[PDB]
């Protein structure tokens, strides 16, 4: 839509986000942190950590960073998609009113987009490189062909949105799903657009869509005004979990005795 | 089995796999090390971080961290169970609705047991344990003959607090009359201990002998000095392919600089 309508909604969306990601560094958040009791002293030499609390705060690290990736996921998925564009979800609950897109034929098909000209097309949603092989391209294959076959008149054609990086080296596996092995050819139906393609696609040819999204998310993490203060909070975090494990893991020094935490962990 | 061959064995795998771990630090793998060019804002400000090599720092920690996780869940399903204890993997009787089980076990007199492995503490809603004891039960319902018992075997964590939801899995219908079969002679939840217990035929001290074969692989593989260099490395590498296009004076980066060159 236009650079500001997409900014804004955008910037919405993430501000919101940006706020769950705030929400897990309380107190009470830290006791579902996990850590595996037989992964301990490999992290510890791998890093090269000197001592438990730098193992707590590596393995907290990347809970948050991971959650990070998670809840992003979502962000694009969920809210995104389906609020500032028209790229509407498939969850279960949308797909029982929505006419039969129940079947299990559509579980690869995350969201439909019904343009202003009447056009529809199914989006199967992806991240990253994500760099599928033969075994997988020749199944997603059958999987397009049974949806244009069965149900033609509900979409004009089927899409694999890769949301960012690109298709430079994976364009013989998309080139398929088109001469030679298993596969039915659906050139003409089935198109595989990745980064600011996924996006000037997304947004119906406004090729600068990528970086409304980009700044939209760049002013919700300038209001969210984080920088400064969750260097303590994050810290915390690390008291929280810490202090479940130091009277009885800990020797004076400050390591920890692996086989105390294992013990504590798996009892 | 017996405190050094549970420990000879596990080492021996854990050796493969540090392997496998170390192989990831080279030049030509941090060419697969992925950005989310979005995300990068937030992961600067979220992490009070102060210029580009600190964000790819960052990424690279979280992408090795993320790594060794996934490495040692298949450690554990392919190579440890299988090989230490002998519970192989159903990897290709079957093929029917056995999607939750895992493994299988033939024990010494001719018992077979099928194992769910879990990972983390496991806290499953009351709704999930209700579907996956319909699913037990309509499994140990048919074919007797290779289904003594069905366990979930929870390799990490313990059963504090979470055990009520175990116990309708397994059958406890109370005034709530729960839509679940008493199953609870042939189904059971082992976490921690017991799981490395019941994997090893009653042997409480297995996950602490499972523990030493992985700290010993770890002592001969002597990662911990030449690593810190290897990973600085690595960051530089990932850093350089992108350093001249983002790089302001300060250090920071053109954000948008960094999108456009990744989703070209």
């Given at each position: 839509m236009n650079k500001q309508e997409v900014i804004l909604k955008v910037q919405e969306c993430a501000a919101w986000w940006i706020l769950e990601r705030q929400s897990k560094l309380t107190k009470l958040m830290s006791e579902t942190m996990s850590i595996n009791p037989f992964m301990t002293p490999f992290i510890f030499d791998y890093h090269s950590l000197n001592d438990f609390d730098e193992l707590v705060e590596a393995i907290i690290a990347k809970h948050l960073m991971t959650g990070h990736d998670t809840g992003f996921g979502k962000l694009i998925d969920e809210k995104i998609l389906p609020?500032?564009?028209?790229?509407?979800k498939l969850d279960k609950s949308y797909r029982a009113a929505?006419?039969?897109?129940?079947?299990?034929?559509?579980?690869?098909?995350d969201h439909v987009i019904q343009r202003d000209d009447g056009r529809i097309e199914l989006l199967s949603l992806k991240a990253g490189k994500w760099t599928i092989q033969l075994t997988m391209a020749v199944q997603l294959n059958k999987a397009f062909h049974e949806i244009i076959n069965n149900y033609?008149?509900?979409?004009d054609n089927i899409v694999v949105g890769?949301?960012?990086?690109?298709?430079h080296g994976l364009t013989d596996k998309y080139r398929?799903?088109?001469?030679?092995?298993?596969v039915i050819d659906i050139r003409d139906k089935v198109h595989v657009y990745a980064g600011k393609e996924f996006w000037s696609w997304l947004n119906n040819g406004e090729a600068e869509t990528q970086h409304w999204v980009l700044e939209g998310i760049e002013r919700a993490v300038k209001e969210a005004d984080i920088k400064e203060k969750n260097k303590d909070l994050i810290e915390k975090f690390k008291e929280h979990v810490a202090k479940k494990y130091?009277?009885?893991?800990?020797?004076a020094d400050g390591t920890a005795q692996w086989h105390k935490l294992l013990e504590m962990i798996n009892e």
């Open positions: 609020r500032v564009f028209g790229a509407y929505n006419e039969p897109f129940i079947h299990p034929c559509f579980d690869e098909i033609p008149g509900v979409a890769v949301f960012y990086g690109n298709s398929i799903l088109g001469a030679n092995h298993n130091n009277e009885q893991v800990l020797n």
